[PDB]
Amino acid sequence: LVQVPSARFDVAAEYSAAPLVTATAFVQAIINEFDVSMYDANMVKAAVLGRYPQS
Amino acid sequence: AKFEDKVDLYDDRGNLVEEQVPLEALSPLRNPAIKSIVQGIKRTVAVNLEGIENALKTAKVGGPACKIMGRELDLDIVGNAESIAAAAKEMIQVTEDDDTNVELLGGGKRALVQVPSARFDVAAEYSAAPLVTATAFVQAIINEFDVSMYDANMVKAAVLGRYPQSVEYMGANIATMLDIPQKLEGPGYALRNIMVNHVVAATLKNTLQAAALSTILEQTAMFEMGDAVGAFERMHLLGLAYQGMNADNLVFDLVKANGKEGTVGSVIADLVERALEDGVIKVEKELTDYKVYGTDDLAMWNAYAAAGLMAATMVNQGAARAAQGVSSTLLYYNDLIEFETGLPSVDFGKVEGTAVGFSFFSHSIYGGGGPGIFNGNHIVTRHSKGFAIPCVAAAMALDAGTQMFSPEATSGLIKEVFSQVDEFREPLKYVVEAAAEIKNEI
Amino acid sequence: ADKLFINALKKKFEESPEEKKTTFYTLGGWKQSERKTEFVNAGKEVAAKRGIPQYNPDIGTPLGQRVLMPYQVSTTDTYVEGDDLHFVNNAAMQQMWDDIRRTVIVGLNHAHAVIEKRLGKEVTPETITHYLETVNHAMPGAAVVQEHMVETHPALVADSYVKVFTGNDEIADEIDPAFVIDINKQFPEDQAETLKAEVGDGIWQVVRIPTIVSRTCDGATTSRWSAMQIGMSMISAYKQAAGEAATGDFAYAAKHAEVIHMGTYLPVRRARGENEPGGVPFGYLADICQSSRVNYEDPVRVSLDVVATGAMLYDQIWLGSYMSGGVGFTQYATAAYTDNILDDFTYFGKEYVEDKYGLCEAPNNMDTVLDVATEVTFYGLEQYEEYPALLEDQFGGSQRAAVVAAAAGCSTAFATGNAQTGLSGWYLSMYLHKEQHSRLGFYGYDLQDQCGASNVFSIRGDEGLPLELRGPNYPNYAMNVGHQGEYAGISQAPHAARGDAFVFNPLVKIAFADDNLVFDFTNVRGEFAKGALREFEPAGERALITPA
Amino acid sequence: ADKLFINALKKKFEESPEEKKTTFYTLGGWKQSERKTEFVNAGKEVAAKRGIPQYNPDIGTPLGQRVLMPYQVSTTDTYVEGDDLHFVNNAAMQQMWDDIRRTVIVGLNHAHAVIEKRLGKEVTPETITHYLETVNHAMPGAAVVQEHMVETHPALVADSYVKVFTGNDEIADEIDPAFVIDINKQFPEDQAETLKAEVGDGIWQVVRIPTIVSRTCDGATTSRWSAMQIGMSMISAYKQAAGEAATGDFAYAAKHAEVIHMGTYLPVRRARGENEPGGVPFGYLADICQSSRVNYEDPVRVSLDVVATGAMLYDQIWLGSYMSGGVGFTQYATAAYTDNILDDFTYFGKEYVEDKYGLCEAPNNMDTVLDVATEVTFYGLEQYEEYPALLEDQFGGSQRAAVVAAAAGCSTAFATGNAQTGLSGWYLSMYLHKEQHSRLGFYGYDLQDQCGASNVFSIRGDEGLPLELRGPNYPNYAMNVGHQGEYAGISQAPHAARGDAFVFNPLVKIAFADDNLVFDFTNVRGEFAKGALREFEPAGERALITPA
Amino acid sequence: AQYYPGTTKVAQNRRNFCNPEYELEKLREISDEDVVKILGHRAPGEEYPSVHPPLEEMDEPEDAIREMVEPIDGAKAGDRVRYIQFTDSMYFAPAQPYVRSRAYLCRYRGADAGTLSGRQIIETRERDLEKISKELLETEFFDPARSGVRGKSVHGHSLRLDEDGMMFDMLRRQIYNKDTGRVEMVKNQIGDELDEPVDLGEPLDEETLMEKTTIYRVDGEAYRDDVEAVEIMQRIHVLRSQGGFNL
Ligand code: F43
Ligand code: F43
Ligand SMILES: C[C@@H](OP(=O)(O)O)[C@H](NC(=O)CCCCCCS)C(=O)O
Ligand SMILES: O=S(=O)(O)CCS
Ligand SMILES: O=S(=O)(O)CCS
Ligand SMILES: [Cl-]
Ligand SMILES: [Mg+2]
Ligand SMILES: [Mg+2]
Ligand SMILES: [Mg+2]
Ligand code: NA
Ligand code: NA
Ligand code: NA
Ligand code: NA
Ligand code: NA
Ligand code: NA
Ligand SMILES: [Zn+2]
Questions:
Q1: D308 lies in the same domain as D367
Q2: Is D398:D483 a contact under the CB 8 Å cutoff?
Q3: Ligand 11 centroid from CA D145, angstroms
Q4: Residue (of E186, E185, E182, E184) closest to E202 by Cα position
Q5: CATH number reported for the structural domain that contains residue D21 in this entry
Q6: Which of C100, C125, C145 delimits the end of a domain?
């Protein structure tokens, strides 16, 4: 369960900071946890947020 | 306390305001003046009462060259603007003492509306501003003249246009700096889909203020997009500081030194020297008669390079007093600096790339247009994460009349209303003062 | 004397139209029909050729336990089986949509000011004519500047061209008349004066891209393709650098600043770009139809030619294919343009209104709505009751709902001269019909009709809109058959009674007043009939680049 | 021993390919060309029939001051003028896009669970066969339930059908083989085994709607049309009420919960619905191409057939018409599939890698990128420098940049077995090329390429994506020619070298292994040649319903 | 400034074009009126058109940037923005496309330069354009056989030469005179005939083209053999690659 801090919405136009801030924090935390290489980290991104931004 | 950097902050005359401000005092996440700018842009609407009245009287509603013969309604809206605006304010406000503002402009022809913050506190996004304002003015006009049930739909069409048959408010006589949520190129982009001409219009063509408003909007969007989270946060904050807030007077001082006779190339040489002088970069290796520079702080090199980029625009486009070359400056500033130094250009090539397509899509047949119609949400100019568009705003501010799609043509209603708001018009002043004010809370 | 539908009913059935009983089950199922017979035979050839079973009359239930009826195309003496009015089987219908999809209206007013103010050059009728010769080479897909360009085959793209119009008779007269839509020739004199006043001295291009490209691609292609070849032709005819900063102002003007799309883009659940059917507002569809300039002494004929145009496009192609597909919605639409049934009901209402009020002379209020919509509703439903053949012909309740309501709505607008009261009349018709027969349409037919009365006069954000501005993307209207084309007709009705030259957009009206179109928009129902009979010749075919 | 493009250069020019001088200006302009001569005469015919000037060789500048060259379609012995490779003049190219646009993949796994769990009925190979006979009647536009339905002409929709596949060989053997895509017949043993393991016991439909509907309507029509006739066929074959609550589960399954579109919908500035070229991700395009199953010992050939597929679709039809239009972008794309030039450079790099590392055996890092991409880049640019005829053939810098980088990026993926380092090699090739000749492509060519290096390995929101998931809507790629087709090739490259059966989606790969398709996806460059010679017979023509 | 890495003659030529203190060699003399004729934007002795009123007649925002940045003379007067465009042969023309844009933004103020494979352009205020154009046409930026002034129909950078050593021009704007061994401009840059042709001098000979060129080629100096230049390009790739991933 993740609840992104209110202060991020206070200076945002809408609500997509929740998924986007959560996704990148977990992507970077996973990469950092296992020291995933530069070459393979794009796979962790795809596993978290999917086909975005092509979709 | 997350970052140790400090910056000195100046005004748009090059005078020091406040020394040694922690970098995070300029974060969108912490600075109250950036919050107020964003909340302001979300909630402010411009109403064209004259346009509504003319649309009704001619029955020209619902988009370009549209008209409905026999539907004409002759109502003296501008003549009764005070009454209508006061009636509209009653519906727009939540309570009598809140931050609702309704102000008549141009003898009743226009109105500045700021919808109360309480409505946005229980809203997903920002469309309550136009929709609450539009319905309050439709209802106030109908109530003012006792327009019949049979005819009132024409008042709706004169205010909000062909919506909902069109997705947009097509032919509307209201305007906002933001655009509808459906037109976002990605989630998190709304603060990018603000035309450069609107930014230049609101800041009255003051170059540094336009650069400041543009950079605040761009870098704040970078937090909503998540781009300024974790590893990249500091790069974005140093970019806001040095490229858009004239941190350390670096932009200002490069323009001063190159303004009379300089070129892109001369600004570059001054910047590299200054980065050398400050310890940001240093010689890593010597080739044959060629020094390769290195840096132990890429984020700070990027910011210094970014500050150089802004100043080269102001010098190059300022010397022409013609904005079109900003696309060239964004390209060759970065191309030249890489072969000058052996270090990556601003935003690691992304400014340069943005500038390549922006040049194409402003000097060809296939699309874009002049510099003033672009923005961070435009497909041509979304690619750099905050480091390209603020240069465009500065170039359009310096244009002396070479454009057909100038701010006067695209942004006249935005200028008349949004330039009234002090924080929109002179954001560099408010943001620096706030950062000074919270400087010990970091 | 006879109702107008009596001839059709007599051609369909051996019984007089008043008889209440008939014979079923002994007609031979599909074997009664020449067209079904053709289809069974073709199914067998198809399946054998490709190695996969296809059309088979023994699958599912056995068609033709009742009479499979011929339909009269209203206003004609053509009778065809309904399969011949399926859009897939009818090249006139396909070409009608292509002619709209491939058209965009693009001003020259901003472009000419770029030329004079930014480039510092002159614009004259001579330069305009030179430009129009240039763009009539370029637009079909041929080159004007670069060396070693490869080009479209002129014969495959013969239907692509660019014309202009303007309200300034003296300018119009100087341009080569090959390129000019002549407002004074195409429109009766009062209409011409209105339209020329609207346009004034603006000069507007009507651009048509090739049908072959519109079929390969989509509607959102049209304005892009148009802008490319306008931009090349401006470079060539006015001598810019071939790609300088000022070139970009022509691009922006042609794609955005002085462009009139036929349709606007749609929201994500029905994601489509510009120039698709769902973006075409009802008032534009009325103005595309050219019945107004030829039949202007008969407001019924004008209105019901609009109904035919919209019922085919919006129910058969749009809702019946783009938004669904399969066998689809032929006869939900054919009810509004066949057997002269809508025409009989609508001519009744026109005569009622004419005799009681005078056209356009009723008060614009609910008292007129209640009066006219009720009287015409009771008239139409009574025909179904007095002629069992008529009820067997329009067998689906949805079909009868749309036909009776269209007559009631159109007649109400003939009385008030206002579309919005016409629309109220449509909804009231539905409610009265539902109570009279204890049925109305298909399971989901009256979503919009139950929201209907309350939303006619609403002013709220996604509720309130004059009818002329509504279209297929008006929220209540976004899903269902048997309404959109009739709404286009009600939009036309008051303007036809008033003698107005256009309903919503005078540029759109003039843009389709063009004899170089493939489809004849002056006689929509005549064209449907020609396509049904396999006599219409479309653009876009690939025969020249394929084997013999 | 010769470079592969030497025959082509000898065909085009009188000089030896190494000669630096030639003769211009005395070739007769357009009169040197058979094709331009056909076009001039056709333009006269057109203009005289319609009353409006059209193609005219004297508008603008005079083509053919240099040699208007023939092009060899790569891997063939067919030489044609470039105009014959324009998508407008080539029915093979139009049909390739129609076969993609009109296809949707629809599971039967949820549907069969509705039947068993909600209706409480049984599903076996026999019920599925009955269901498939029913849906092959209904899918083209014919009826199974109601009385008095009017239907599509079976011969107009002969290219519409439904097939199934499954990974369970014993189930597949019990369904009538007319309806089954046979994985063991279509794929080599090891590929078959991989694909069957991905599918397992799932059963999936491949649905193709009629080309004539696809051309009338749009890509987003396909999954709707599919769902309508799946729904009718489920009602008929499994004895539901025709319209009960459980009917809705089938509708949601077919449109939403087990549907695989060819392309996803696009954002508003390039508003389009599903199954348009811009939504097709590069990995799917590589899987649509069927070179992998036939040319599986030659990873260069597989990869360059993907490049041809994507350069035509993405540059000629998508960027050159949907997103722009006019003369368009034929030779920006033909550079990657003509004269055996990309083939020469890529075989060079494949051989280099194979000899130095072994395919797929180089370390997946920047050292390999720097090695392979630099070496191949320098090979390709040397050919243009050594053969003046080659540089005059690929006369536009963009064409050269795309070709040279495609070779470099494919070669780099050949070495690492990973697309992402292949893509890094593409961008490094552009940077080296730009410095070597002091030029790269057209004005806006390297927007993506200057962003490129940094975004290859980024993980940020709208930046980070494996190459296989990227497509025409990846932000930096959304606008420009001379990249998208090449990227589809680089996505194929590492999988071809590995011998993988698919690049990104195994259902998409099986779906196009179907001999009832019109276009032959196993030999894309062969088909382009056939269409250029006017020998390809497309679906969707209206000859049967128009005058002889 | 160091401008560009590398140890070939090409790399030194690239650095020289950029360096504003390097005096371009003058090869030919052209009148002011013939510059105006070649541009084709106005007739000699025609007043400069304007796009806006002179700067001193307008009321400008109080703006320290405006105050610090001196306007070029054409900006002060309100001149049109106009252009001159060149095409450079890959057969050893002295200047080349990216070399021009890099050098233009190092030497010239108020410049909008664009680089393409077959054309390179600068747009600036008309009276200032006329001054730059003199230097672009009179110095070793230009050779009359291997370079071309072309506002449209630019084809020819990548084509074989004709028998005289001249680059292809679809519109044949530059005509080689066998009798003098000199080239004349017969048309302006957009292709309209000049009343009187303009002498552009003699083409540089093979050995002088080799000494002055900025293109790398296997039959000249190959880029792959300028190993220090290649090393910096590879370094930029690597550092951009790593910065986009992390910092
Ligand atoms: C399965 C459904 C429910 C569903 O959502 N749509 C159906 C079926 C669908 C199929 C039937 C084709 C076929 O037979 O295989 C199509 C042609 C749509 C498609 N998939 O192509 C259609 N309906 Ni229906 N549907 C129709 C109609 C109607 C009327 C028919 C009433 C009667 O008394 O005959 C009723 C609704 C009502 O009661 O008002 C109706 C029902 C039904 N409609 C019932 C099946 C009825 C039955 O079992 O007989 N249609 C009509 O009212 C007129 C037009 C007609 C459509 C074809 C065309 O327009 O030509 C067709 C439109
Ligand atoms: C007006 C523009 C600017 C604009 O945005 N697009 C143009 C023109 C446009 C037109 C030319 C059609 C015509 O001649 O009427 C079309 C066909 C697009 C359309 N409208 O159909 C096109 N370019 Ni262009 N364009 C191309 C190219 C190029 C190359 C040509 C260089 C050379 O030396 O010949 C250069 C850019 C470059 O220098 O890198 C170029 C520029 C230009 N490009 C210059 C005009 C150049 C000149 O005046 O001659 N294209 C290419 O390099 C190859 C493919 C080619 C495209 C046609 C095809 O793909 O078959 C065409 C693609
Ligand atoms: C940029 C954008 O154009 P606008 O600026 O939106 O007018 C976009 N066109 C393009 O991206 C055209 C792409 C292909 C033709 C350019 C050739 S590289 C569009 O039509 O959606
Ligand atoms: O039976 S339903 O009314 O659901 C379908 C109408 S065709
Ligand atoms: O000249 S441009 O690079 O703008 C066009 C390429 S077709
Ligand atoms: Cl950092
Ligand atoms: Mg009898
Ligand atoms: Mg009776
Ligand atoms: Mg002199
Ligand atoms: Na009879
Ligand atoms: Na049957
Ligand atoms: Na949808
Ligand atoms: Na044929
Ligand atoms: Na030869
Ligand atoms: Na010509
Ligand atoms: Zn289509």
A1: yes
A2: no
A3: 7
A4: E182
A5: 3.90.390.10
A6: C100
Residues D198 and D281 in one domain: no
Strands in C209-287 per DSSP E: 259-260
Q: Do D156 and D118 share a structural domain?
A: yes
Q: What are the structure tokens assigned to D308, written together?
A: 């041809």
Whether residues C478 and C358 fall in one domain = yes
Which tokens belong to E209?
Answer: 């083209």
State the smallest CA–CA distance between residue B36 and chain A in angstroms: 8
Residue C97 in 3-state DSSP? helix
Does residue C153 have a known ligand-binding role?
Answer: no
CB contact under 8 A, A52 and D462: yes
Of the candidates C332, C352, C384, C427, the residue annotated as catalytic is C332
CB contact under 8 A, E1 and B268: yes
DSSP secondary structure code for residue C203 in this structure:
E
In a domain? residue D506: yes
D443 labeled binding residue: yes
Read off the tokens for D35: 């094709």
State the distance from the centre of ligand 3 to the C-alpha of D429, rounded, in angstroms.
26
HEC-encoded secondary structure of C273-325: CCCCHHHCCHHHHHHHCCHHHHCCCCHHHHHHHHHHHHHHHHHHHHHHHHCCC
Q: Are residues D82 and D131 in the same domain?
A: no
C178 touches E184 (CB < 8 A): no
Residue D528 and residue D407 share a domain: yes
- The domain boundary residue, chosen from C100, C131, C163: C100
Which long-range contacts (C-beta less than 8 Å, at least 24 apart) are formed by E129-134?
E129/E39, E129/E41, E129/E74, E129/E82, E129/E83, E129/E84, E130/E32, E130/E35, E130/E36, E130/E39, E132/E84, E132/E108, E133/E35, E133/E38, E133/E39, E133/E84, E134/E30, E134/E32, E134/E35
Q: Which long-range contacts (CB under 8 A, 24 or more apart) does D44-53 make?
A: D45/C154, D45/C155, D46/C154, D46/C155, D46/C158, D49/C158, D50/C158, D50/C161, D50/C516, D51/C178, D51/C516, D52/C136, D52/C161, D52/C163, D52/C178, D52/C179, D52/C516, D53/C133, D53/C136, D53/C137, D53/C178
D442 lines ligand 5 (CB under 6 A): yes
Amino acid letter, residue B292: V
Q: Which atom of ligand 4 is nearest to the CA of C332?
A: 7
The reply to whether C315 and C412 lie within a common domain is yes
| Amino acid in the structure at residue B414 | I
C330 lines ligand 1 (CB under 6 A): yes
- CB contact (8 A) between residue B356 and residue D453: no
Chains near A with 3+ CB pairs less than 8 A apart are: B, D, E
Query: How many domains, in total, are found in chain C?
Result: 3
The domains of chain B, with CATH numbers, are 1-43+191-442 (1.20.840.10), 44-190 (3.30.70.470)
Domain that holds residue D218: 101-275
**Cβ atoms B323, B403 nearer than 8 A:** yes
- Ligand 5 touching residue E117 (CB < 6 A): no
Q: Is C548 among the domain residues?
A: no
Question: Where residue D216 sits, what CATH number does that domain have?
Answer: 3.30.70.470
Cα B345 versus chain centre, distance: 24
Q: Give domain status of residue C453, yes or no.
A: yes
With b meaning 16 or more CB within 10 Å and e meaning fewer, what string describes B271-286? bbebbeeeebbeeeee
Give one DSSP letter per residue of B113-168, joined into a string: EE--HHHHTT-SSSTHHHHHHHHHHHHHHHHHHT--TTTHHHHHHHHHTTTTTSSS
Q: Is C379 known to be catalytic?
A: no
> Is the domain of C92 the same as that of C138?
no
Q: Write down all domains in chain E, each with its CATH number in brackets.
A: 1-247 (3.90.320.20)
Q: DSSP secondary-structure letter at D475?
A: G
C176 within a domain of the structure (yes/no): yes
Closest-CA distance, E235 to chain A, in angstroms, reads 17
CA angle (B352 as vertex; B348, B354 as ends), nearest 5: 110
Distance of residue A48 Cα from the nearest chain B Cα, in angstroms: 14
